Design an enzyme around this catalytic site. Structure first.
Site, PDB file in Angstrom:
ATOM      1  N   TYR A   1     -21.327 -15.810  14.933  1.00 19.19           N
ATOM      2  CA  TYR A   1     -21.531 -15.182  16.243  1.00 19.19           C
ATOM      3  C   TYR A   1     -20.926 -15.985  17.396  1.00 19.19           C
ATOM      4  CZ  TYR A   1     -24.764 -11.730  14.245  1.00 19.19           C
ATOM      5  OH  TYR A   1     -25.316 -10.680  13.545  1.00 19.19           O
TER       6      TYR A   1
ATOM      7  N   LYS B   1     -29.755  -8.398   7.338  1.00 17.89           N
ATOM      8  CA  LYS B   1     -30.435  -9.350   8.206  1.00 17.89           C
ATOM      9  C   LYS B   1     -31.870  -9.620   7.769  1.00 17.89           C
ATOM     10  CE  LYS B   1     -27.431  -8.324  12.097  1.00 17.89           C
ATOM     11  NZ  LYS B   1     -27.435  -7.984  13.535  1.00 17.89           N
TER      12      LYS B   1
ATOM     13  N   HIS C   1     -25.459  -6.416   9.908  1.00 17.12           N
ATOM     14  CA  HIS C   1     -24.200  -6.703  10.576  1.00 17.12           C
ATOM     15  C   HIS C   1     -23.024  -6.064   9.826  1.00 17.12           C
ATOM     16  CE1 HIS C   1     -20.925  -8.875  12.546  1.00 17.12           C
ATOM     17  NE2 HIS C   1     -20.411  -8.887  11.330  1.00 17.12           N
TER      18      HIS C   1
ATOM     19  N   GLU D   1     -14.728 -13.232   9.315  1.00 19.22           N
ATOM     20  CA  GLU D   1     -16.105 -13.308   8.833  1.00 19.22           C
ATOM     21  C   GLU D   1     -16.147 -13.484   7.321  1.00 19.22           C
ATOM     22  OE1 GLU D   1     -17.925  -9.808  10.496  1.00 19.22           O
ATOM     23  OE2 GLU D   1     -17.737 -10.565  12.558  1.00 19.22           O
TER      24      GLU D   1
ATOM     25  N   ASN E   1     -31.977  -5.662  14.119  1.00 19.85           N
ATOM     26  CA  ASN E   1     -31.333  -4.383  13.853  1.00 19.85           C
ATOM     27  C   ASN E   1     -30.722  -4.305  12.472  1.00 19.85           C
ATOM     28  OD1 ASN E   1     -28.929  -5.856  14.076  1.00 19.85           O
ATOM     29  ND2 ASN E   1     -28.727  -5.374  16.270  1.00 19.85           N
TER      30      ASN E   1
HETATM   31  N1  LIG Z   1     -27.984  -7.422  24.421  1.00 18.54           N
HETATM   32  C1  LIG Z   1     -27.969  -7.902  23.148  1.00 18.54           C
HETATM   33  C2  LIG Z   1     -26.824  -7.778  22.381  1.00 18.54           C
HETATM   34  C3  LIG Z   1     -26.813  -8.259  21.086  1.00 18.54           C
HETATM   35  N2  LIG Z   1     -27.881  -8.863  20.580  1.00 18.54           N
HETATM   36  C4  LIG Z   1     -27.927  -9.383  19.200  1.00 18.54           C
HETATM   37  O1  LIG Z   1     -26.745 -10.063  18.774  1.00 18.54           O
HETATM   38  C5  LIG Z   1     -25.893  -9.161  18.083  1.00 18.54           C
HETATM   39  C6  LIG Z   1     -24.938  -8.754  19.178  1.00 18.54           C
HETATM   40  O2  LIG Z   1     -23.734  -8.486  18.549  1.00 18.54           O
HETATM   41  P1  LIG Z   1     -22.908  -7.199  18.949  1.00 18.54           P
HETATM   42  O3  LIG Z   1     -23.003  -6.919  20.422  1.00 18.54           O
HETATM   43  O4  LIG Z   1     -21.610  -7.589  18.324  1.00 18.54           O
HETATM   44  O5  LIG Z   1     -23.691  -6.033  18.156  1.00 18.54           O
HETATM   45  P2  LIG Z   1     -23.451  -5.419  16.694  1.00 18.54           P
HETATM   46  O6  LIG Z   1     -21.969  -5.458  16.445  1.00 18.54           O
HETATM   47  O7  LIG Z   1     -24.333  -6.262  15.813  1.00 18.54           O
HETATM   48  O8  LIG Z   1     -23.957  -4.006  16.839  1.00 18.54           O
HETATM   49  C7  LIG Z   1     -26.736  -7.934  17.739  1.00 18.54           C
HETATM   50  O9  LIG Z   1     -26.702  -7.600  16.351  1.00 18.54           O
HETATM   51  C8  LIG Z   1     -28.137  -8.298  18.176  1.00 18.54           C
HETATM   52  O10 LIG Z   1     -28.803  -8.913  17.073  1.00 18.54           O
HETATM   53  C9  LIG Z   1     -29.037  -8.970  21.370  1.00 18.54           C
HETATM   54  O11 LIG Z   1     -30.041  -9.523  20.877  1.00 18.54           O
HETATM   55  N3  LIG Z   1     -29.061  -8.498  22.637  1.00 18.54           N
HETATM   56 MG   LIG Z   2     -20.463  -7.544  16.369  1.00 17.60          MG
END
Ligand SMILES: Nc1ccn([C@@H]2O[C@H](COP(=O)(O)OP(=O)(O)O)[C@@H](O)[C@H]2O)c(=O)n1
Ligand SMILES: [Mg+2]
Ligand SMILES: Nc1ccn([C@@H]2O[C@H](COP(=O)(O)OP(=O)(O)O)[C@@H](O)[C@H]2O)c(=O)n1
Ligand SMILES: Nc1ccn([C@@H]2O[C@H](COP(=O)(O)OP(=O)(O)O)[C@@H](O)[C@H]2O)c(=O)n1
Ligand SMILES: Nc1ccn([C@@H]2O[C@H](COP(=O)(O)OP(=O)(O)O)[C@@H](O)[C@H]2O)c(=O)n1
Ligand SMILES: Nc1ccn([C@@H]2O[C@H](COP(=O)(O)OP(=O)(O)O)[C@@H](O)[C@H]2O)c(=O)n1
Ligand SMILES: Nc1ccn([C@@H]2O[C@H](COP(=O)(O)OP(=O)(O)O)[C@@H](O)[C@H]2O)c(=O)n1
Ligand SMILES: [Mg+2]
Ligand SMILES: [Mg+2]
Ligand SMILES: [Mg+2]
Ligand SMILES: [Mg+2]
Ligand SMILES: [Mg+2]
Lengths: 133, 133, 133, 133, 133, 133
Positions: free
Chosen positions: D50, D9, D116, D127, D113
């Site tokens: 996303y 990222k 991905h 993806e 974070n």
């Molecule tokens: N409460 C949240 C949840 C996700 N996000 C963002 O959007 C993505 C959410 O995707 P996700 O829930 O699938 O999380 P990951 O699979 O990336 O851990 C995250 O990587 C965060 O960048 C956020 O900004 N705030």
């Molecule tokens: Mg995810």
């Protein structure tokens, strides 16, 4: 300046790709373009190393360069060409300085982990070979 | 070539054993033999350093070398003798280059972490001392 | 000897503070005093760099040095002044050697991560500036 | 044997952690089979990537962040690559990501974070076809 | 205070991870009290080492792997060395080994998993007498 | 956004782990806002710092240890700094601290455990006013 760097197949074989890229990254050089090649075409390799076509090692060199993957990268930074050359280290394992990529990591004059353009003229040239767009 | 390397007691004291071995390992040198000594016999030490028997530091040097454990290692590789010497760095802390083992890690001319054979003749000699078999 | 080292604002910006301190720590130099400055007073900076007051870069240099935090540290060790200078690396990015702090990490002649006293005379001087007590 | 899609990222580029992150996956012995550098990913690729989050409060900020700097898209290959790399990655929430994970050690925000990783076989295939159609 | 028996497995040599693994144990402040390098361990020592597994489906492959390259046998000493080093080691199964563990970070196979560590006081005493009789 | 008080303990200096520990917190993107080096902390500050433990069997040994070498007191700032740094720190008991944590990787004693971190908002405010009144 922009310079062309290759991560050579030996880096993939020895799991040193991140190590090498990280050294350049930590010096604060920026990736401008990057290509992953599962195997570079031999013709590309031969073009890249055209100045070596009459050397006894030419064919072994070409074989090595298609023996595994390669990453081509264009790096950008002030004086990037000379600076990355110094980080790279000398071709010869009897000369490359501890602290350089080759001095620390490479033990062979052939399999030496990394290519970097040696001049502005060759940079332009090599960038056009790997990134013709 | 094969060269004899000693990890000296100061490396154990300062928890630098893996650090030093890892530097040689990352350069792609192969361990051919290795011995751990909880304390090397003084006679071995005196033989290893026989060329220094008339130096004012001889006795302090011998005391230091039996002050803690030592690992003796035979490393093998093309030009391993000269190459490991360059990785080792100069004996003197005013000269050992950043990037070398001593340049990065050692701050004393006596307690300097690592021995490496300085020539083919001395390699054969030192290997026979530490690995008489 | 004791020498005065500054961790410059660029180290904080680039998250390199531990990296740099760790290099000196691994060489076995001991911290005698240390001060964290969220922003050093400009007058301190101007005193520290008084020999440069007539250089064209003087004002940009002072601005940079107050642009972020600084850590001042007094290090102690045998020949600490010259030794830390060698670890530091040359001011110029075209010259600083891979393996040195600047050779590995810095890419600019201005923003170059670290100050170290260059002589006994300047050490005494700089220590009095940053640690007047 | 499986393939999974990883994105490095934009925060990774900003904080110079690209090689650090790639290196953790590399040391775990996963092999790159595809890789593309994006100086700036197209908004639509990101929104498609996303698409599951399109009605979430954080969607616009997420998409904005994701186009605020370069990204690298990588296809990694290995036995159980998907779950294993998810494990390396660590929990989205910095209150929950374990030390030793990429996010646990390196990330301090739920949004920014660093990495991905595809979360299942079906999402991996989706993806992968988005970034490498 | 306890002693435990560790083997560095042949995959560690192949992947140049010997110092990496030893280094993690070293940083945790465990002390080497015995160590032996085996360019190739005798089949019978290996079969005796794993005698508990002799009727398991994976036994022959395990023994074959274990003689396919060098190993190092090490006796480590420290307070609660046995359980603590088992914790560093990580779970046999790459689906379960936690990031931050040796296997969690480095191993990607249930068989080729880099390190052996005695799993109890009784097995430690047994294994120590096998490798250091 | 929160502030937490960290002490680097005397064992960290003895074992040359100061930068290692600070570096883990730095890579997690926490910012130093105050920092003071103590060549030897006053007994009374230490006893006040641990006043909760004053009737515990280990109190005198703890205080003795804490004045046996330098310490650094640091105020770190970041979102949920308190719980997050506690997580990095790891469990007091070396039988329980997870690999990947500071203590899990580095500490091998319940007493000599390298780092203190405030355990709540109220204790953070108290400890901060002790070290930085
Ligand atoms: N409460 C949240 C949840 C996700 N996000 C963002 O959007 C993505 C959410 O995707 P996700 O829930 O699938 O999380 P990951 O699979 O990336 O851990 C995250 O990587 C965060 O960048 C956020 O900004 N705030
Ligand atoms: Mg995810
Ligand atoms: N004596 C030699 C010289 C070069 N070579 C190969 O050819 C490439 C280098 O030619 P070069 O003189 O342009 O060396 P570098 O710029 O790569 O240091 C090397 O990277 C080696 O892979 C070789 O195999 N044997
Ligand atoms: N002036 C000196 C020279 C050597 N020595 C010791 O004697 C050993 C080195 O003698 P040497 O000239 O063969 O040095 P190296 O080959 O070890 O660099 C060193 O490793 C030191 O431990 C010393 O204590 N003081
Ligand atoms: N040409 C120059 C020379 C110095 N400088 C700055 O002034 C300080 C150095 O002057 P100096 O010659 O004492 O260099 P060092 O001792 O810091 O290597 C540097 O650290 C730079 O920040 C600059 O910006 N441009
Ligand atoms: N299902 C299994 C279990 C173990 N093994 C191998 O044989 C050893 C099994 O010993 P173990 O169950 O005591 O595992 P560890 O104590 O080595 O984690 C492992 O280290 C693997 O090399 C295997 O190949 N397949
Ligand atoms: N059973 C114990 C508990 C704590 N201690 C010491 O005193 C401190 C106890 O404080 P604590 O229980 O708040 O532990 P931490 O918050 O430091 O993990 C520890 O850091 C140990 O140095 C000890 O020596 N023996
Ligand atoms: Mg060339
Ligand atoms: Mg010699
Ligand atoms: Mg100067
Ligand atoms: Mg077992
Ligand atoms: Mg507490």
């Amino acid at each position: 300046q922009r310079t062309l760097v290759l991560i050579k197949p030996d880096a993939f074989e020895r799991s040193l790709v991140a190590e090498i890229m990280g050294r350049i990254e930590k010096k604060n050089f920026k990736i401008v373009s990057m290509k992953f090649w599962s195997k570079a075409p031999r013709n590309l390799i031969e073009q890249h190393y055209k100045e070596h076509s009459e050397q006894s090692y030419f064919n072994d060199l070409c074989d090595f360069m298609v023996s595994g993957p390669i990453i081509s990268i264009v790096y950008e930074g002030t004086d990037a060409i000379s600076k990355i050359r110094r980080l790279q280290g000398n071709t010869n394992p009897l000369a490359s300085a501890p602290g350089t990529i080759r001095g620390d990591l490479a033990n062979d004059i052939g399999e030496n982990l990394i290519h970097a353009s040696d001049s502005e003229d060759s940079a332009v040239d090599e960038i056009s070979i790997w990134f013709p767009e």
